[PDB]
Amino acid sequence: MNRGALIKLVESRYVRTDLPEFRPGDTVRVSYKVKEGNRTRIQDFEGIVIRIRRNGFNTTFTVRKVSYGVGVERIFPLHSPLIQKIDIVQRGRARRAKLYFIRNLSDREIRRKLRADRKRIDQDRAAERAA
Template sequence: MTNAITELGNAHKRDDVPAFRAGDTVKVHVKVVEGSRSRVQVFQGVVIRVHGSGVGRTFTVRKVSFGVGVERTFPLNSPIFESIEVVTRGDVRRAKLYYLRNLRGKAAKIKERREA
């Protein structure tokens, strides 16, 4: 039974998603449908968590828009977004960056990870 479930899940997995983790800054190109029209909206922010595994995997992106913190959670294998683009790689020591919610200004800035 679990074999059938994993096969079904693998059929719906997206293969165009780049590898990213908490602390990375990403641009998520989201499809927005308004009535009969459809357009692409870019949501850029810091990944504060990656949750789950397999088909049900989700990630949460946080940005500050006009002084207000905005968080949005996306299913990783969802057709809602067209693409994900990694802007910068962050150097963090935590898997969940919930502490960023309480930080303001430069304190909320994440150091860039240098590749060796």
């Protein structure tokens, strides 16, 4: 037998391919289905992705934002059915896979360290030229 293949097989039903590719450093908006009273609704969460742990179906990514004066980080499964959509709001250029150092940087300092990933922006406009 092939244990890996069997696992991928169990997983194949839950895999998603409708979400856009993004990198650590990109700014991203995750529309997330969320439960309250007595309804479920979509809440957006928008921030820099500071990390993407890979493990195929199990890869997860972490997004950080400042909300009303307090730092928040959210961790999402990339294949979570609760994600309605992800919109790329900006491409940042990182030099590092994991950006935990931005937790201690000022807003000025961050903006200086994560400049616009001019290449991947142009690349983004190049597509988005449709038929």
